[PDB]
Amino acid sequence: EDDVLCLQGLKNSLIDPSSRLSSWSFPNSSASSICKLTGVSCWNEKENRIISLQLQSMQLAGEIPESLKLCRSLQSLDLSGNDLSGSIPSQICSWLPYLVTLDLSGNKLGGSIPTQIVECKFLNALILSDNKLSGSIPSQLSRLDRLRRLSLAGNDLSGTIPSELARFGGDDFSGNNGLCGKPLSRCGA
Amino acid sequence: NMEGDALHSLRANLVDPNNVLQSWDPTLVNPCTWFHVTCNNENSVIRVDLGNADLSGQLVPQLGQLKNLQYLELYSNNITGPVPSDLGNLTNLVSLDLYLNSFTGPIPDSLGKLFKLRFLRLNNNSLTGPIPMSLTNIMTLQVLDLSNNRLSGSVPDNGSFSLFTPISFANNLDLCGPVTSRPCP
Ligand SMILES: *[C@@H]1O[C@H](CO)[C@@H](O[C@@H]2O[C@H](CO)[C@@H](O[C@@H]3O[C@H](CO)[C@@H](O)[C@H](O)[C@@H]3O)[C@H](O)[C@H]2NC(C)=O)[C@H](O)[C@H]1NC(C)=O
Ligand SMILES: *[C@@H]1O[C@H](CO)[C@@H](O[C@@H]2O[C@H](CO)[C@@H](O[C@@H]3O[C@H](CO)[C@@H](O)[C@H](O)[C@@H]3O)[C@H](O)[C@H]2NC(C)=O)[C@H](O)[C@H]1NC(C)=O
Ligand SMILES: *[C@@H]1O[C@H](CO)[C@@H](O)[C@H](O)[C@H]1NC(C)=O
Ligand SMILES: *[C@@H]1O[C@H](CO)[C@@H](O)[C@H](O)[C@H]1NC(C)=O
Known part of the structure; x- marks a missing residue:
């Protein structure tokens, strides 16, 4: 199946210095x-279809792997508090179109937030705080119909927050590289 | 004992080739010693675990008398007939798993009264009619699967149904809505 x-390739591609995926x-x-493997929740008890992967605080390193496309029934991905690096793959929403919750916070992901994030049409939560993300916040994030939670604090983001995202609070955008506009302070003042 | 009677009624309406219900002796004081039934400390039924049991036959409305029922696991059998409306009386239920069966008829609107429900998996059956809108009021709902049925009409996206995607609704008769491919007339 x-x-x-998906899980075989994920284990083969990530760096796992503390052997946290040994089991x-x-x-x-x-x-x-695979439904009883640590970090795995299945849709039901008759198939290996995975609904969520919770691999948070496992000392994992490497880049976010393409193997995730084989977990196509996935709705929740939590890779937070690891040592992952590289960029947020621009293919991520074509790998995982049915994502409801995406939590990649507390890693070392660089580059910018790809505009193809908009292709995750069902996203309720996008949690990307405490990474090394740079550039502008793409205004495509305003077009996510279901987005109720957005966490971009503690990155290196710059420029003006898109006016459509001002519904979210200041805590969601704070600790960035001269990022400005509502809900943060006015640009240059 | 009312709970024991309700489960004996269920046994009477099930067809049990492998005799998994052999221990279900009606003459006992309660059903708490019966295999596949779990009681709590106060001798009240909290689980019925009858997955993969090769059961056929039909459910009975008396199941709704199991007022402290938390887990109803009847998945992967060949049970026919409707989902009884009386299941909506089971207000302590956290898991309602009737998937991989041959249930027909509608999803009863009374399932919207199950306000603690976390798992609703009725997928892989032959259920018809609309998805009741009252299901959006269940704010504890974590996993919903109604796929592989013969449901039709509009799919909600409000309330708890914000968490759900086309995976929950796939391969039905004629569902429509923004969450589905086709928009509604
Ligand atoms: C719930 O019902 C659906 C619909 O019938 C089941 O999906 C179907 O499952 C069968 C497997 O028994 C699929 O056939 C297989 O397709 C795959 C390609 O995805 C192929 O690699 C296999 O060789 C085999 O041909 C079938 O295509 C699939 N979908 C449909 C629309 O028929 C589902 O499995 C049921 N759930 C359970 C737990 O049985
Ligand atoms: C999700 O959206 C749907 C549709 O917008 C909501 O369903 C509707 O809920 C209202 C009550 O808020 C129902 O109206 C009531 O009808 C009864 C009986 O006719 C009447 O006594 C009340 O005075 C009121 O008019 C309405 O019937 C119902 N729509 C249906 C069933 O299609 C739903 O409540 C929303 N849920 C959440 C959690 O936001
Ligand atoms: C592997 O197959 C055996 C024999 O069917 C089965 O008992 C066992 O549970 C399976 N284990 C896993 C981890 O899939
Ligand atoms: C369930 O509750 C309803 C009232 O809401 C009642 O009519 C029905 O008899 C009850 N069913 C059972 C099996 O106790």
Whole structure:
């Protein structure tokens, strides 16, 4: 099944210096039951379809892997508080179109927030605080119909907050690289 | 004992080739010693765990008398008939798992009264008619799967249904709405 290969590829591609994914085994190859592996929640108890991956604070490093496209039934991805780096892949919403919650906070992700984030049409929560993200916040984030939570604090973001995102509070944008506009202080004043 | 009677009624309406209900002896004081039934400390039923049991037959409305029921696991059997409306009386229910069966008929509107419900998985059945709008009032709902049924009409996106995506609703008869491919007339 595709979901078993998702987890196999994720384990093979991430760097795992503390062996936190050691308990993940695949004794029946592609047909292994993976619903009791640490960090994994399945839709139901009759299939290997994964609804959420919670791999937070596992000392994982490397880049966010393409293997996640094989976890296509995924709605919640929490990779927060690890040592992941590289950029937020611009393909992420084509890999995981059904994401409701995306939490990549507390890592070392650089580059900018890709404009293709808009393709995650069902996103309720986008949590990207405490990374090394740079550039402007793309105004595409305003077009996420269901976005109720946005956390971009503690990055290196710059320029003007898109006026549509002013519904969110100041705590959501604070600690950035001269980022300005409501809800933060006015640009240059 | 009313809870024991309700479960004996259910046994009478189930077809049990592997005799998984053999221990369900009606003459006992309660059903708390019966295999696949869990009681709490006060001898009241909190679980019925009858997945993968090769059961056929139909449910009975007396299940709604199990007032402290938390888990109703009847998934992966061949149970036919409707989902009884009386299941909406089970207000302590956190998991209602009737998936992979041959249930027909509508989703009862009374399931909107299950205000503590976290798991509602009725997928892989032959349920018809509309998704009741009262299901959006269940704010504790974490996992919803109604896929692989014969449901039709508009799919809500408000209340708890903000958390749900086309995965929850796929392969139905004629659902429409922004969450689906097709918009409604
Ligand atoms: C719930 O019902 C759906 C709809 O029937 C089930 O989906 C279907 O599952 C079968 C597997 O028994 C699929 O056939 C397989 O397709 C895959 C490609 O995805 C292929 O690799 C296999 O060789 C095989 O041909 C079928 O395509 C799939 N979808 C449909 C629309 O029929 C689903 O599995 C049911 N859930 C359970 C737990 O049984
Ligand atoms: C999600 O949105 C739907 C539709 O916008 C809401 O359903 C509607 O809820 C209202 C009450 O807020 C219902 O109106 C009431 O009808 C009864 C009976 O006719 C009447 O006694 C009341 O005075 C009131 O008019 C309405 O029927 C219902 N729409 C349906 C069933 O299609 C729903 O409440 C929203 N849920 C959340 C959590 O926001
Ligand atoms: C592997 O297959 C065996 C035999 O069917 C089964 O008992 C076991 O639970 C399976 N284990 C996993 C992890 O899938
Ligand atoms: C469930 O409650 C309703 C009242 O809301 C009642 O008519 C019905 O008899 C009850 N069902 C059972 C099985 O106790």
